[PDB]
């Protein structure tokens, strides 16, 4: 009947009431808000403090327009 209870009710507010609600389910408004999770790649990106990290100059990857025109042949 709670199935049918929802039908005979203002759609605006069941949509309204269920939205601000999962939203307050996600907030931590009680004191210190929690700490987000980290996956083992993210945790080791914060300690790659030594050398230059692996990154290619975008010159070497951006294929020229005039050599790409050649490349769609045969």
């Amino acid at each position: 009947s709670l199935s049918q209870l929802l039908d005979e009710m203002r759609e605006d507010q069941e949509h309204q009431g269920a939205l601000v609600c999962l939203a307050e389910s996600c907030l931590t408004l009680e004191g210190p808000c929690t700490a987000p999770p980290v996956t083992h790649w993210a945790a080791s990106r914060c300690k790659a403090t030594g050398e230059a990290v692996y990154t290619v100059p975008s010159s070497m990857l951006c294929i020229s327009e005039n050599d790409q025109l050649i490349l769609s042949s045969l």
Binding site: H15, C26, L27, V56
Partner: protein, 302 residues
């Protein structure tokens, strides 16, 4: 009996690397070699963000930098709104015990009515990254915003302009002049939240998560430096999601470990049958020949 397969260009015949290294460019070949060497040795720094237009290669921002930006965003109180809430509704919480923090969640309206959480678009002010993370895993879209002096505007493009699940979406800071949030009314499809159509309405040109790698292949006649820049074809792992999930991060760890098993000899390495294109790069009147890997993906490895 081959670790990577071509997804096209299978009418071509295999070219030896010794023949390619002395040839003119541009040209397209079919090769199969063993992965003797590759960079980076640390795979977590292989995911970057390519700007499709201006070909900008840049780094995916650090998560700790994201956490600081939203922790710093918690300040004073918002711009409320005005007779402006024709596109969205709103609900302001007041927090106890956090320097007067007051978050502002704004629910985008679909044609005037509010939808379910599975097809809704969230607009947060003063949320923290963790609260942003969990909001994203129950709602459909979360766009972190701030109170401008007239209308809700986006954050600095260091912070994502769109978050749906585990995918943060970034716009290029150099080739995307913003339009403010009230231009989302221009969407004809306000139930399906296409990141491309949200970015277009905001005037944002999105960056592309692409794996950027350098391979040193060897087929027995010579070694070659082939670049690998792709989004979600090679590893069958979407680069858009990889930095937010152990399972996908772990999966690309073991794929590289089967291309190049560290600890044994190259005799027992599997072949990588790839399709490469050569091209001429210019850095002045310098002129290099360098090779990108295309149309290749691993087979039977999930």
């Amino acid at each position: 009996l081959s670790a990577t397969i071509l997804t096209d260009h299978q009418y071509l015949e295999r070219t030896p690397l010794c023949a390619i290294l002395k040839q003119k460019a541009p040209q397209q070949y079919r090769i199969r070699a063993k992965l003797r060497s590759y960079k980076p040795r640390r795979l977590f720094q292989s995911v970057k963000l390519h700007c499709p237009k201006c070909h900008l290669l840049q780094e995916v921002p650090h998560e700790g930098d994201l956490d600081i930006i939203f922790q710093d965003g918690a300040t004073k109180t918002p711009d409320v709104k005005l007779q402006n809430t024709s596109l969205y509704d709103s609900k302001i919480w007041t927090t106890k015990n956090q320097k007067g923090r007051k978050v502002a969640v704004h629910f985008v309206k679909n044609n005037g009515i509010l939808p379910l959480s599975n097809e809704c678009l969230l607009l947060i002010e003063g949320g923290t990254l963790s609260e942003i993370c969990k909001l994203s895993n129950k709602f459909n879209s979360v766009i972190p915003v701030r109170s401008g002096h007239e209308d809700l505007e986006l954050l600095d493009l260091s912070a994502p302009f769109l978050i749906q699940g585990t995918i943060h979406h970034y716009g290029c800071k150099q080739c995307s002049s913003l339009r403010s949030i009230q231009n989302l009314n221009s969407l004809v499809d306000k139930t399906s939240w296409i990141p491309s159509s949200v970015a277009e309405a905001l005037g944002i040109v999105p960056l592309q998560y692409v794996f950027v790698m350098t391979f040193t292949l060897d087929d027995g006649t010579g070694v070659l430096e082939a670049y690998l820049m792709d989004s979600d074809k090679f590893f069958q792992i979407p680069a858009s999601e990889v930095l937010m999930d152990d399972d996908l991060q772990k999966s690309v760890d073991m794929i590289m470990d089967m291309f190049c098993p560290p600890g044994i000899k190259i005799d027992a390495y599997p072949w990588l049958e790839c399709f490469i294109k050569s091209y001429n790069v210019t850095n002045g009147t310098d002129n290099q020949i360098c090779y990108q890997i295309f149309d290749t993906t691993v087979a039977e490895d999930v």
